[PDB]
Structures are given as C-alpha cells and as structure tokens.
Amino acid sequence: MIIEGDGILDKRSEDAGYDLLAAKEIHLLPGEVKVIPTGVKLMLPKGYWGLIIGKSSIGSKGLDVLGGVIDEGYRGEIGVIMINVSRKSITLMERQKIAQLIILPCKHEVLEQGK
Amino acid sequence: MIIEGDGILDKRSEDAGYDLLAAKEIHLLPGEVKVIPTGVKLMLPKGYWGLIIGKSSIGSKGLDVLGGVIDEGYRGEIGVIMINVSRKSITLMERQKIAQLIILPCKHEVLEQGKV
Amino acid sequence: MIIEGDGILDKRSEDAGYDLLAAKEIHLLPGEVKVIPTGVKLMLPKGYWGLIIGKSSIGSKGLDVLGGVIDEGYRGEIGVIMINVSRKSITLMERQKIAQLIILPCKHEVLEQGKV
C-alpha cells in the first residue's frame, strides 16, 4: 500500500501489524494524555481500515495507547493517543516504536429501522 | 442491518464504523467506570460481530472503552463501558458522540488439545 | 486450532471470542505493571492473528488491561499485560477470567512510498 512519511516500518508476513514511530521527542507529565505524531499518511486498500493498538514493549513502561481507528477515507497524518498512567514523567525518543497499525476488513451495510 | 432506536448514525462507505451517541448526560469522576446507554438494539448479520472503539475526540480527553465486544448472538440495549483514566472529572452530554461500532467477521474454531 | 494449556475455554458460535483465564494467583502492588500468565500456547490458523480484550469486570476493579496482539507466528505462552491504577494492592486468583481472545484476519503488503 501507499504511504507518505517515514514513521512506519514494513512487517514480516507472520506479523499482524506495522510498527508506528514517534515523529519527535515527547515528554508526558504524570497522568497526561497526548496525541503523538507519526508523520505518516496512508492510502488504505478499499474495504479496509487500520486499527491502532499498543505494543507490549511500551505498555510495560506505564503508557496506555488508546484504541485508534484509521478510516479508509482518512488521508491526514496518523496520530497515536497515549496516556501516562504512572506517577512520574516519561519521555519518548524520536523514532521510538510506540504503536502497531493493523489492517482489517471493514463491512458496510445500510441501517434499517426495524424491530 | 436492522436497528431499533436512534443512538447510532449511518456511515459512508469510506467510514470504518457507525457513530454511537449517548442516550443521557453522564458525569465521570477520575478513575470512575460507568456504562453509557445508547438506547439501541441491533441484529448483527450472520458471521459478524461488532467492536466498539472510542472516537479520537473522547479518547483525547482521557476516556477509554472497556470490553467493546458485541456478540453476534446479543440483542439487548447496546451499552458502552466507559472509563475515565484522566485526573479530572468529565461530563458527556446527551446525544454526544462517544464511540464507533465496527462490524468485523467472526472466526469459529474448535479448541483441540495438542502439541504446539 | 491446536492449543496447549488449560487457560482457555471453548466458545459458542455466537461468541466472538474465547475466555482467557489467569494461570495463577498474581499480586499487583499499587502502580505496578505486570504480565498475567494464562499458560496457553496457540497455533493460530494461517492468515489470522489474535486480539486480546480485557474483561470489563476487571477493568472496573482498579486494573487497566492493555489490548494485546498475538501474531500468527507467535508460539510462546500467552500473557496479558495489566497496570494497577488504584491506591491499593490487587490480587488476581488462579483460573479467574481476565480477557477474551478474538481471531481476526490479517492483511499483508509491502509498504510503498508514494503520494496520498
């Protein structure tokens, strides 16, 4: 698929998702929620959407990545919503792996008001 | 898909999921967990289940969705388990958008004891 | 599919996923991050991965269950990561239900620099 930017890595066939990288250094205060920039834009294959989810690597550092949805239509740059649930400040280095992007099929149906 | 209620909105073909609205005003203290009623019931097509995920606008505020798994064989009023993981209280308003329902395919396998 | 272990339960066809059980009694001190062992190994079918979603009941009980991903090629023992977000110690008991395992299709493609 087509991408723009360099904050995303190719993956192995047996891997489920692509690693997302922080576009710059980030400092998270205790309890802070922050949208982390990746600097990448994607062109998803029709019929699919991207699920953003945490990597165990950073989850073990006290940072919870909130579930993200990348729509087939979405052409903006990808940001990862992250919260620091620990009691101290945490720093993320530039280009550090922060999340995983997984491409899943999406089903579209019309809504009928029935019983 | 067949629905009952109006706490869900239709989507574009390029939209991965359908927006879910809050059926009433909800106040959440820091660390508190509440189920937010949507006032909607739905019949999932065969072979699919529904995943609930929060929208960027609420996640960006410290709200997360717990156990957003709607089973293909479920017919009660869809309720969203929401947790306020931020350090302050927040109020979600009536009919405010709060999550998205994405329809994904089911995959049923039989569990077989064996050598991995 | 082939499994090794006792920490997972068969599911109905209407159930999107299988329940995962804590393999042992785990003690989490206030603010501690820990990997809860399930004692199960899977041999996921080709082209599919495993999505782990925490059980709502435990997320309501002072523990933040991180969403996890089991890769098709992953053959190790399944573990669930959790963070004690309360001001008190929390004990998880052996055989207690901690999450669900959903099997979903995975898409693989080479990444191509282009213009979006």
Residue B13 CB: number of other CB atoms within 10 A? 10
Query: What total number of domains does chain B contain?
Result: 1
Residue to mutate among C36, C69, C81, C104, with most A CBs inside 10 A, is C69
Three-class secondary structure of residue B87 per DSSP: coil
Measure the CA dihedral C108/B16/B90/A90, to 10°: 20
Contact C20, C38 (CB under 8 A): yes
Taking contacts as CB-CB distances below 8 angstroms, the residues of chain C near A11 are 108
Contact C101, C11 (CB under 8 A): no
Question: Which candidate, C99, C6, C16, places its Cα nearest to that of C52?
Answer: C99
| Residues 15-54 in B contacting A (C-alpha not used; CB under 8 Å) | 15-18, 43, 45, 48, 53-54
Strand partners, C92: C26
Task: Extract the tokens encoding C69.
Answer: 């991903």
N-terminal to C-terminal alpha carbon distance within chain C: 39
Task: Extract the tokens encoding C7.
Answer: 């920490």
Contact A80, A39 (CB under 8 A): no
Angle in degrees, CA A51, A80, A40, rounded to 5: 85
Taking contacts as CB-CB distances below 8 angstroms, the residues of chain C near A88 are none
- Residue C62: alpha-carbon gap to chain centroid: 18
Three-class secondary structure of residue B103 per DSSP: strand
Contact A64, A99 (CB under 8 A): no
Q: What is the DSSP string of B44-64?
A: PPTTEEEEEEE-HHHHTTTEE
CA distance A71 to A48: 8
CA distances (Å), origin C57, targets A32, C62, C65 = 25, 10, 11
Residue A2 CB: number of other CB atoms within 10 A? 15
Q: Identify each DSSP E strand in C62-96 by its residue range.
A: 63-65, 68-70, 79-84, 90-92
HSE toward the beta carbon, residue B36, CA cutoff 13 A: 33
- Domain with B13 in it: 1-116
- Which of C3, C15, C56 is opposite residue B81, by nearest beta carbon? C56
- State the CATH number of the domain containing residue B19: 2.70.40.10
Strand partners, B35: B81
Q: Identify each DSSP E strand in chain C by its residue range.
A: 2-4, 17-21, 26-28, 33-37, 41-42, 48-54, 63-65, 68-70, 79-84, 90-92, 97-105, 112-113
- Cα four-point dihedral sign B103, B80, B11, A18: negative
Contact C51, C20 (CB under 8 A): no
Angle in degrees, CA A63, A87, C38, rounded to 5: 45
| Cβ distance of B66 and C43 shorter than 8 Å | no
**Residue carrying the six token digits 């019929």:** A47
- Which of A4, A54, A104 is opposite residue C104, by nearest beta carbon? A104
Task: Specify whether the backbone of B56 is left (phi greater than 0), alpha (psi in -120 to 50) or beta.
Answer: alpha
CA distance A22 to B71: 35
Using the 8-state DSSP alphabet, how is residue A19 labeled?
Answer: E
Contact B28, B92 (CB under 8 A): yes
Three-class secondary structure of residue C86 per DSSP: coil
Residue A103 contacts C, CB cutoff 8 Å:
yes
Question: Which candidate, A103, A83, A113, places its Cα nearest to that of A17?
Answer: A103
Question: Which candidate, A79, A100, A77, places its Cα nearest to that of B56?
Answer: A79
Taking contacts as CB-CB distances below 8 angstroms, the residues of chain B near C104 are 104-105, 107
Taking contacts as CB-CB distances below 8 angstroms, the residues of chain B near A79 are 56
Contact A79, A98 (CB under 8 A): no
CA distance C62 to C89: 9
